[PDB]
Amino acid sequence: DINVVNALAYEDFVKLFGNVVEKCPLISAAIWSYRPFKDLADIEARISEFIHSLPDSGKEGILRCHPDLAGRDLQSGTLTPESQEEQSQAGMTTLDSAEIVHMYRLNSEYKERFGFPFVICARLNNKADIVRQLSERLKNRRTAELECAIEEVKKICSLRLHSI
Amino acid sequence: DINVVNALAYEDFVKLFGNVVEKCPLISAAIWSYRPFKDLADIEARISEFIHSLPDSGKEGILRCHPDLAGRDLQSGTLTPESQEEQSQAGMTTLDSAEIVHMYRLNSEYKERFGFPFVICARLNNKADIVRQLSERLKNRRTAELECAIEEVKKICSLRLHSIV
Ligand SMILES: NC(=O)NC1=NC(=O)NC1=O
Ligand SMILES: NC(=O)NC1=NC(=O)NC1=O
Known part of the structure; x- marks a missing residue:
């Protein structure tokens, strides 16, 4: 209301x-x-x-405030409630050993390239979509990637607003 | 380094x-x-x-992220480490029921006027300086008070930085 x-x-x-x-x-x-x-x-x-x-x-800076998909915060139970729910929805909490090592690998490469974490709207993607986009966005130039990543942040925000 | x-x-x-x-x-x-x-x-x-x-x-928005001096968060023990230590140094942790209630009222008036919390560098102010600034700044115009508050935020930041050092 x-x-x-x-x-x-x-x-x-x-x-x-x-x-x-x-x-x-x-x-x-x-x-x-x-x-x-x-x-x-x-x-x-x-x-x-x-x-x-x-x-x-x-x-x-906004991007850097986000936790990695399936990273340290997930595996330590230190995600915010929203992040925790979103990551489970996208399958991040039930990855097998090989999937976890892969996500670690993909995350490290991304953050090394761009200097912020990989961010996607988890509630709009499944596991496969997530690996696809990570591999895809890895190839982007920095300027185009920043716009892409902020659009995901805005999608996440819209969903969070509508869950209140 | x-x-x-x-x-x-x-x-x-x-x-x-x-x-x-x-x-x-x-x-x-x-x-x-x-x-x-x-x-x-x-x-x-x-x-x-x-x-x-x-x-x-x-x-x-930045100001609105700050807790009130002596407020719900202090009373609930839910301040950040820095805010907690900073308010304890300004005497906010040893207030009696009277003083806690008085801090609440001063903060209420300020925030109703300006639409953000009263912010002061707590590590540079004792309990009497706090009440005094609260009453003077209540008179400021909104335009001016925003700049004044932000300067205080920068002071707090500088001392937090030097504490890390
Ligand atoms: N992709 C991320 O970096 N973080 C995740 N996306 C979400 O929507 N929630 C998260 O925890
Ligand atoms: N004045 C406030 O709003 N907060 C207080 N000032 C500080 O320096 N630390 C605080 O907790």
Whole structure:
């Protein structure tokens, strides 16, 4: 109900919406300045607007706040609830030994090339789609890759918003 | 040693510097793009420039990521390590029921006016300085108070950085 949302104290707005962009509560905290909102779509547009106003370093910074698919945080039970649910949905929690070594290998190569983690919208992809895109995006130039990765962040955000 | 900082992987850099601006690891994460850093001052300068590049809503957003002095989080024991140590040094951890209630009311008035928390460098202020700044800054215009608050955020960041050092 956009009306209860629009009436939220900023503290409560940030508590509810503070993880729609992984570990970046600043983003949701920022867009509260633009209340009242017309609908959830208004909130989405404001968030996209904010992200796109950032320098490239800010975009890369957002990416660096994300945990690896099937990486240290998954295997340590230190993912946020959203990341944990999303990664299980994409099959990351039931990878076999060979699949885990492969994901490690693919992640290391990606981060070495680009200087941020590989990010994809897990809820929109299965295991196979994920390996396909990783191998694919590995071949991108940095500028094109940054745009690609931020689009996945925005998709993740939209789904997270709609799960609230 | 800046050489060692300059050699950190972003995962390690974010882990170590991710809380120099409260609950805003994004800023630490962003500035890693500009490495190598000449010195600590280059780091602070990149932080400052990043913050200054944000829209006003981003600056407000940063402030909104800070907990209240003596507030729910302190009482619940759910502050970040730095905030916890910083409020204890400013005398927020040994307040009686009266004072806790009084801090709550001052914070309520400020945040109702400005639409973000009252932020002060706690490691440079005692409990009486805190109440005094709270009352003076309540009079500021919103435009001015935003810049004043952000300066305090930069002060906190500088001392967090030097504590890491
Ligand atoms: N791809 C990632 O880097 N992280 C994952 N994508 C999601 O949507 N959730 C995650 O945990
Ligand atoms: N003033 C605040 O809003 N927060 C406090 N100032 C600090 O320096 N540390 C805090 O926890």
